[PDB]
Amino acid sequence: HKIDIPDSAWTIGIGEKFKNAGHPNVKYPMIDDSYVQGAPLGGFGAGTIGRTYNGGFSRWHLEIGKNKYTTVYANQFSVFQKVEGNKDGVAQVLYAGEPGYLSSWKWDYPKESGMYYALYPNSWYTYTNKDLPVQLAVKQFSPIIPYNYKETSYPVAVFKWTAYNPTNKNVDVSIMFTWQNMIGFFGKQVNVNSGNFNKIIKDKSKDSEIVAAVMGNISNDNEEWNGEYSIGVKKVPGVDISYKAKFVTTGDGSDLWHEFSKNGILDNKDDETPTKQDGIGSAIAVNFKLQPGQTIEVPFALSWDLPIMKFGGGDKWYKMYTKYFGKNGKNSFAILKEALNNYQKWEKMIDDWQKPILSNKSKPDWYKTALFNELYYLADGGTAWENGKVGERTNNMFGLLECFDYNYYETLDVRFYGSFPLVMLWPDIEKQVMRQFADTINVQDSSEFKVGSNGAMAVKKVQGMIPHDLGSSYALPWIKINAYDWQNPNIWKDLNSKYVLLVYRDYVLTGKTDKEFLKYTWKSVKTALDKLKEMDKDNDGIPDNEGIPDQTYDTWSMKGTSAYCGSLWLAALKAAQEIGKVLKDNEAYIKYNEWYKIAQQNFEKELWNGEYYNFDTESDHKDSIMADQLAGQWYADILRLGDILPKDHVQKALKKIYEFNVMKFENGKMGAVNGMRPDGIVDESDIQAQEVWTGVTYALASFMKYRGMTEEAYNTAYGVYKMTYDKSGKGYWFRTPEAWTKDGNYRASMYMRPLSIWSMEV
Numbered sequence: 001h002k003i004d005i006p007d008s009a010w011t012i013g014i015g016e017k018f019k020n021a022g023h024p025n026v027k028y029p030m031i032d033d034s035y036v037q038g039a040p041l042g043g044f045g046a047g048t049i050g051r052t053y054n055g056g057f058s059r060w061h062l063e064i065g066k067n068k069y070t071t072v073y074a075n076q077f078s079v080f081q082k083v084e085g086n087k088d089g090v091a092q093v094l095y096a097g098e099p100g101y102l103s104s105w106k107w108d109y110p111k112e113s114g115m116y117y118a119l120y121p122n123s124w125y126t127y128t129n130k131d132l133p134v135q136l137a138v139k140q141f142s143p144i145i146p147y148n149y150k151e152t153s154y155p156v157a158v159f160k161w162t163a164y165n166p167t168n169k170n171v172d173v174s175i176m177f178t179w180q181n182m183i184g185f186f187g188k189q190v191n192v193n194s195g196n197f198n199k200i201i202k203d204k205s206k207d208s209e210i211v212a213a214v215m216g217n218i219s220n221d222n223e224e225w226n227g228e229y230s231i232g233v234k235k236v237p238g239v240d241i242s243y244k245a246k247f248v249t250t251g252d253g254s255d256l257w258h259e260f261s262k263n264g265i266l267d268n269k270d271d272e273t274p275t276k277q278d279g280i281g282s283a284i285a286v287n288f289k290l291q292p293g294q295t296i297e298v299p300f301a302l303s304w305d306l307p308i309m310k311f312g313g314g315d316k317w318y319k320m321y322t323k324y325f326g327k328n329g330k331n332s333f334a335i336l337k338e339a340l341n342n343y344q345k346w347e348k349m350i351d352d353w354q355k356p357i358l359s360n361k362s363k364p365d366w367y368k369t370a371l372f373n374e375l376y377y378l379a380d381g382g383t384a385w386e387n388g389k390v391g392e393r394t395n396n397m398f399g400l401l402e403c404f405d406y407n408y409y410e411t412l413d414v415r416f417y418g419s420f421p422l423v424m425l426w427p428d429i430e431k432q433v434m435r436q437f438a439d440t441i442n443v444q445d446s447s448e449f450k451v452g453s454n455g456a457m458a459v460k461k462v463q464g465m466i467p468h469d470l471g472s473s474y475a476l477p478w479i480k481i482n483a484y485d486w487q488n489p490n491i492w493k494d495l496n497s498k499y500v501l502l503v504y505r506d507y508v509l510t511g512k513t514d515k516e517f518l519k520y521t522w523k524s525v526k527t528a529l530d531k532l533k534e535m536d537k538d539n540d541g542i543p544d545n546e547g548i549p550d551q552t553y554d555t556w557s558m559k560g561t562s563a564y565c566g567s568l569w570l571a572a573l574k575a576a577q578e579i580g581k582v583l584k585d586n587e588a589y590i591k592y593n594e595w596y597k598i599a600q601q602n603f604e605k606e607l608w609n610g611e612y613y614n615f616d617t618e619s620d621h622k623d624s625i626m627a628d629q630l631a632g633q634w635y636a637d638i639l640r641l642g643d644i645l646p647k648d649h650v651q652k653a654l655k656k657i658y659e660f661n662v663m664k665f666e667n668g669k670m671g672a673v674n675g676m677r678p679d680g681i682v683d684e685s686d687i688q689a690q691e692v693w694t695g696v697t698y699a700l701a702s703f704m705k706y707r708g709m710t711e712e713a714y715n716t717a718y719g720v721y722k723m724t725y726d727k728s729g730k731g732y733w734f735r736t737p738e739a740w741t742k743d744g745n746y747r748a749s750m751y752m753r754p755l756s757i758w759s760m761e762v
């Protein structure tokens with residue numbers, strides 16, 4: 001109890017069954033890993049490990065770009081306790097479940113005997129069990145730290161244990177970490193355990209004894225599958241350390257457990273014999289005597305040196321952390337040791353960055369829960385961050401997935417919303433990613449592909465058009481762009497605009513100092529806008545939508561001028577004028593001013609209806625109230641470009657959207673539904689109209705807030721938090737979807753868009 005857990009921590013009971021869980025609302029197959037989830041461990045680009053609220057290591061994102069949900073049962077903390085003057089102690093795995101293998105271990109950690117807490121990047125378990133006299137807690141984390149691109153990359157996790165004797169008898173206590181040697185868990189085509197072997201490192205520095213297990217393979221190949229895992233522990237005063245190098249994971253486990261269940265002391269048996277077919281594992285234990293009212297603290301850690309990521313198109317790359325530890329895959333212990341000797345400083349750095357928000361008492365706790373915990377996705381979103389192609393440079397390219405069902409890196413129409421944490425907290429990455437986009441503006445690929453929607457054929461990448469994405473983990477990230485094919489992004493009317501807007505946002509949100517960034521991207525920017533002007537068929541100064549989904553709402557058709565694409569256009573034209581003034585490009589300034597003036601008038605005349613802006617000029621659903629109708633004006637605010645539309649009209653539109661899209665949709669308890677009829681019935685023109693998009697809502701909430709509709713902002717955002725985290729929601733913690741319908745069922749779990757919540761902190 002007496003450990004420093006913040007009140008805004010999301011919490012749930014260990015072993016809790018959740019009764020209202022959502023499921024996918026589409027016909028085609030889609031990922032549904034259940035609600036047994038937790039906050040990820042692991043750095044940016046290191047690959048991540050999802051340890052759930054029940055205690056299992058179950059959501060593996062170690063193969064970069066893939067999601068594999070499966071509990072590796074030998075991966076556990078276990079405990080032994082014995083009250084002085086009792087015949088027998090007891091031993092228990094801290095896992096609220098059971099396996100096949102390991103039948104001798106003590107499974108099924110009981111209900112109503114502990115809690116899980118999460119405030120990303122930290123999570124905690126507390127163990128308050130009728131049969132466990134000594135109270136235990138653990139704080140686990142990886143050093144995810146804004147404006148630090150070093151520790152933030154590390155494939156490491158720390159588990160700081162606290163143990164308290166409230167009783168009046170002396171108790172002997174042990175805490176054991178077990179890990180399977182997971183070399184060959186993926187990337188290995190034959191003989192998945194063969195050549196795996198475990199060794200014990202005893203590092204005996206003055207005041208810093210470490211005992212570690214290094215679990216690897218005898219091969220020195222340089223393959224995605226090869227590397228080391230390490231688990232270990234730092235000696236503190238009053239604890240003894242014991243270990244077991246090699247127990248069989250594809251066995252009953254009694255080789256390990258009979259010695260731990262006796263007195264909580266392992267055999268200290270080293271054995272480097274490689275295995276052939278049997279799965280193997282290691283065990284690191286502490287044992288201590290706790291006197292009445294005594295507290296002891298002890299840190300364990302877990303590293304993983306898997307230096308190569310491979311994508312399905314053939315390319316192999318080094319992971320970013322290899323810059324600081326090496327590339328040979330023999331460095332797990334160096335990574336473990338750095339963590340064991342520096343974790344206290346890392347806790348403080350995490351504290352130093354969370355404090356400004358946590359200590360602001362004008363903000364409710366639920367909003368802090370959502371803001372920090374939504375950050376999980378930055379590590380867990382199949383994040384790729386390279387330090388050289390294998391057998392190959394200034395930069396380190398970066399990609400974040402849109403999601404796993406739609407396995408696209410950096411989908412631009414989505415990162416327009418989802419990119420806020422990177423511009424605000426890791427701006428050097430954000431500027432790297434946007435240079436990656438600038439570099440593709442004039443790539444041509446005349447090779448043709450089949451459009452999944454209408455069936456027709458189209459060119460892959462047209463010169464002057466911004467790509468929808470920078471490839472797929474199943475193909476070739478950064479090299480082969482436009483992996484997406486359900487529509488043709490080369491005629492989308494939003495991407496070029498959002499591109500320009502993202503450029504100027506990244507200038508503006510990093511202090512308006514970085515002229516070199518504007519200089520590098522300037523030509524891509526002029527090109528993008530010049531190309532989109534060519535799509536103005538009817539000569540009103542605004543690109544026309546073509547009676548098809550030619551924008552991010554990729555089944556929802558727009559025709560003529562639309563509020564969404566049209567507002568983005570005007571804002572983009574305004575940003576360009578500004579960049580043009582900054583760089584002293586008189587003719588850009590003059591031209592983009594002229595186009596903006598004409599487009600502005602005409603947007604107004606075509607679309608303003610007295611109450612809101614019409615969805616578009618030409619659809620059968622033209623008079624629908626769209627949640628995202630003024631997305632250009634939202635970005636203009638963040639960009640400090642002023643009114644692109646009249647203040648009074650923007651206020652009316654927002655008020656209307658709140659009144660209709662939020663309030664008339666399940667009593668405003670679930671976010672902003674995308675499309676509503678002026679009669680107050682949800683628009684049925686497409687499935688996307690009947691969906692709430694979590695990131696459109698959080699962005700809309702931020703817009704509301706900058707415009708002083710503070711109560712409407714937080715009420716609108718609340719529905720998203722509620723659905724995601726709350727007992728009355730749908731069980732989407734650490735897998736926030738793109739969307740849900742009125743019944744609360746979902747589409748596309750683990751989704752980038754909801755990172756838009758950070759726009760609320762601008």
Ligand SMILES: OC[C@H]1c2[nH]cnc2[C@H](O)[C@@H](O)[C@@H]1O
Nearest residue numbers: 406411413484552553554738
């Ligand atoms: O949920 C809509 C998104 C989606 N759905 C299926 N594919 C995609 C695209 O990658 C993205 O551009 C769309 O906005």
Ligand SMILES: [Ca+2]
Nearest residue numbers: 536542543544
């Ligand atoms: Ca037009």
Ligand SMILES: [Cl-]
Nearest residue numbers: 025026027028
């Ligand atoms: Cl479907």
Ligand SMILES: [Cl-]
Nearest residue numbers: 293294295296
């Ligand atoms: Cl003490």
Ligand SMILES: [Cl-]
Nearest residue numbers: 314315316390
């Ligand atoms: Cl390669």
Ligand SMILES: [Cl-]
Nearest residue numbers: 363364365366
């Ligand atoms: Cl509160």
Ligand SMILES: [Cl-]
Nearest residue numbers: 405406407408
């Ligand atoms: Cl896909």
